[PDB]
From a paper:
[name] ([name]), a superfamily of LRR proteins, is the principal receptor mediating innate immune responses against infections by Gram-negative bacteria. In this process, myeloid differentiation protein 2 (MD2) recognizes various lipopolysaccharides (LPSs) released from the Gram-negative bacteria, forming a complex with LPS at its hydrophobic pocket. In an attempt to prevent the systemic immune response caused by LPS, a [name] decoy receptor was constructed by combining LRR modules from the [name] ectodomain and VLR. The constructed decoy receptor was shown to attenuate the [name]-mediated signaling process by trapping MD2, implicating a potential therapeutics for bacteria-induced sepsis and inflammation.
Changing phenylalanine at position 63 was likely to form a hydrophobic interaction with Ile-66 of MD2 in the crystal structure of the decoy receptor/MD2 complex. Phe-63 was substituted for tryptophan and leucine for the interaction with Ile-66 in MD2. From the structure of the [name] and V134L mutants, it was expected that hydrophobic interactions would increase by introducing a residue with a larger hydrophobic side chain. The [name] mutant displayed increases in the Coulomb interaction and LJ potential by 17.08 and 11.02 kJ/mol, respectively, indicating a significant enhancement in the hydrophobic interaction, as expected. Trp-63 concurrently contributed to an increase in the charge interaction via additional hydrogen bonding with the residues on MD2. The crystal structures of the selected single mutants as apo and complexed with MD2 provided detailed information on the interaction modes of the residues at the interface and the contribution of mutated residues to binding affinity. Superposition of the mutants on the wild-type revealed that their original backbone structures were retained, which represents the structural characteristics of repeat proteins.
Numbering used by the authors: 28 to 303
The structure:
């Protein structure tokens, strides 16, 4: 037994030195916290005895691998947290059976590429958090065209250096309703002209990166955009290089959260007026 938070519903099994999933818990359990347990590896049907699971926290469980069908029976699960696991191998069917998964948190799991991240069948997914990883390319794999319900994608604190036009290809031909994209805290110093064309976005975070400039009209092909973060970037406010951005930011002051500032002087980019 773990700490019973709610009878036959919620149990807290964090740090009890478990190496296997507990079998002495109600089959009606909805919430399970198994964080901080040397689980090391997950085999097929690891949670067969918990068909009612909706939220599963497995962060910091020293997990290295996950075999096909590890969560095969959990068809009611909507939140899976894998934060802090030194994952090194991820089978193709590792997330098989998660037909209701809405939130996947894979922060700090040594993720190096989205291509090999076997999540292309989680059509019900609404939130994907892969912040604090080793991803160095923002090129979205073709399977993203099946994630029609995605409204939040967090790629902050990774190794992304730039955003090419091709990177959002998949979203061009299979647009989402209200997508919020977080790309802050990346060593990003380049955005290719027309990389956000035909793209629909509700939020775009690009603060605390390495940007000095952006292509002209980069944000013209957008209207659903509501919030944007550009602060904490070494903006080059010489003219006419800063012309488009300074004007855009001034004609959209409500959208910008925080304040993009000019390197050196510290003057708001939206306050600069370039000569004609
Ligand atoms: C948490 O789950 C346990 C077990 O599932 C609940 O206790 C169990 O309650 C059932 C009644 O729904 C008991 O089963 C049988 O009930 C009939 C009533 O008609 C009675 O005639 C039988 O003799 C028998 O009791 C079962 O014995 C009982 N088991 C336990 C745990 O003692 C418990 O109520 C649940 N707690 C919550 C969240 O309310
Ligand atoms: C998308 O999902 C369908 C249905 O399972 C599958 O056949 C297809 O290969 C997947 N990839 C594509 C085409 O985006
Ligand atoms: C089905 C559940 O577990 C078993 C018994 O304790 C009761 O029938 C309860 O309702």
């Amino acid at each position: 037994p773990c700490v019973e938070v709610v009878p036959n519903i919620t149990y807290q099994c964090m740090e009890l030195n478990f190496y296997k999933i507990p079998d002495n818990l109600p089959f009606s359990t909805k919430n399970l916290d198994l964080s901080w347990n040397p689980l090391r590896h997950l085999g097929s049907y690891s949670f067969f005895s918990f068909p009612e699971l909706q939220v599963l926290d497995l962060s910091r469980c020293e997990i290295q691998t996950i075999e096909d069908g590890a969560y095969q029976s959990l068809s009611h699960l909507s939140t899976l947290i894998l934060t802090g696991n030194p994952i090194q191998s991820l089978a193709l069917g590792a997330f098989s059976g998660l037909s209701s998964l809405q939130k996947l948190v894979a922060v700090e799991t040594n993720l190096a590429s989205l291509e090999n991240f076997p999540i292309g069948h989680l059509k019900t997914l609404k939130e994907l958090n892969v912040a604090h990883n080793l991803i160095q390319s923002f090129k979205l794999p073709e399977y993203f065209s099946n994630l029609t319900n995605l409204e939040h994608l967090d790629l902050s604190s990774n190794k992304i250096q730039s955003i090419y036009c091709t990177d959002l290809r998949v979203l061009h031909q299979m647009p989402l309703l209200n997508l919020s994209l977080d790309l802050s805290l990346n060593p990003m110093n380049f955005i290719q002209p027309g990389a956000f064309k035909e793209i629909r976005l509700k939020e775009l975070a690009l603060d605390t990166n390495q940007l000095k400039s952006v292509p002209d009209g980069i944000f013209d092909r957008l209207t659903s955009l509501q919030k944007i973060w550009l602060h904490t970037n070494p903006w080059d406010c010489s003219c006419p290089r800063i012309d488009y951005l300074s004007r855009w930011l001034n004609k959209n002051s409500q959208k910008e959260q925080g304040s993009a500032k000019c390197s050196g002087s510290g003057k708001p980019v939206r306050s600069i007026i370039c000569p004609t």
